[PDB]
Write a protein that binds this ligand. Structure first.
Ligand SMILES: Cn1cc(Br)cc(C(=O)Nc2cc3nc(-c4ccccc4)[nH]c3cc2C(=O)NC2COC2)c1=O
Ligand SMILES: [Mg+2]
Ligand SMILES: [Zn+2]
Length: 313
């Protein structure tokens, strides 16, 4: 009950900033996550014995892939933690509880391949879930870990609070399907501008939590340049492996996935920042103004990719 996690001084301060990197010491990531839950939520939200057993089962069920791995889970939960802490009064107790777990669980048992590749391979998951294939699987894997003896961190919620939180986590994880981001953001842009945005309308809150999930998921582009650049090697390592597998099925991959086209990476990052990242954090800054540091860090990194193209690094 009276047992806080404390971090060393540099982490205790930097963890509150959007651009915080959780570092290369894996054994500290669980304590960082618990630290974030205790400050975002209270030392009571969860039974420590139970939370600790849920965190280590989740860890176990992420794979050793270059990008979509345990480090990503915790990094995406941290960005959510920073958004929640800079917007204290906008979110319910339930939403704080559900969204940190949603983020930690959002890529469970990812194998390093897109929904596209599962469908062209004809993977069994592609017959069971025809859209948002991996995302329906990640939510499925979350419910499975919650129902292991001694893993139900929500067991002290009322039956109705319990159904509300699983529903928040389900919509939160499905929203990490980038194919659903483009339409969700368009609707939010139209609602915010025509003045109809209403955070007491549940379907509007749904949409907003969805945008938050895309912003946390893409938060590699909001870090200091050296973190952003080294993460891109990890991201491209999964993409090019997926490309190699496309060629094994006799399909030319899209250029993003073709390792023969390493040369064009800088221009391909420009497109990504311009079509996805900048508009994501722009709309997110309009709805939730304290998240502006994410938009500013993203613009700084676009400008660093422009410098790479102009031969200046
Ligand atoms: C999910 N997620 C999380 C992060 Br963080 C970064 C990424 C990411 O880098 N995306 C991209 C990298 C790319 N590189 C090239 C490219 C490389 C070489 C030669 C020619 C082209 N084209 C690219 C397109 C995208 C991309 O998705 N475009 C969106 C807009 O329509 C779908 C990501 O997909
Ligand atoms: Mg994902
Ligand atoms: Zn992810």
């Amino acid at each position: 009950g009276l047992m806080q996690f404390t971090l060393p001084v540099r982490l205790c301060k930097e963890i509150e900033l959007f651009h915080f990197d959780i570092g290369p010491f894996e054994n500290m990531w669980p304590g960082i996550f618990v630290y974030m839950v205790h400050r975002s939520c209270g030392t009571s939200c969860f039974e420590l014995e139970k939370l600790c057993r849920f965190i280590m089962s989740v860890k176990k069920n992420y794979r050793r892939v270059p990008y979509h791995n345990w480090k990503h889970a915790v990094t995406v939960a941290h960005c959510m933690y920073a958004i929640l802490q800079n917007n204290h009064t906008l979110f319910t107790d339930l939403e704080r509880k559900g969204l940190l777990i949603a983020c930690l669980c959002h890529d469970l048992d990812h194998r390093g391949f897109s929904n596209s590749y599962l469908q062209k391979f004809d993977h069994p998951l592609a017959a069971l879930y025809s859209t948002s294939t991996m995302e329906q699987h990640h939510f499925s894997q979350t419910v499975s870990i919650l129902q292991l003896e001694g893993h139900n961190i929500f067991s002290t919620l009322s039956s109705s609070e319990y159904e509300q939180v699983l529903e928040i986590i389900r919509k939160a994880i499905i929203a990490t399907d980038l194919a659903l981001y483009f339409g969700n953001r368009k609707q939010l842009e139209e609602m915010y501008q025509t003045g109809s945005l209403n955070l007491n309308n549940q379907s509007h809150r749904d949409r907003v939590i969805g945008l938050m999930m895309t912003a946390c998921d893409l938060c590699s582009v909001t870090k200091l340049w050296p973190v952003t650049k080294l993460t891109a090697n990890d991201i491209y390592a999964e993409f090019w492996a997926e490309g190699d597998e496309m060629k094994k099925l006799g399909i030319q991959p899209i250029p993003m996935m073709d390792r023969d086209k390493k040369d064009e990476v800088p221009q391909g990052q420009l497109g990504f920042y311009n079509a996805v990242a900048i508009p994501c954090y722009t709309t997110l800054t309009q709805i939730l103004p304290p998240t502006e540091p994410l938009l500013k860090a993203c613009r700084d990194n676009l400008s660093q990719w422009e410098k790479v193209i102009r031969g200046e690094e």
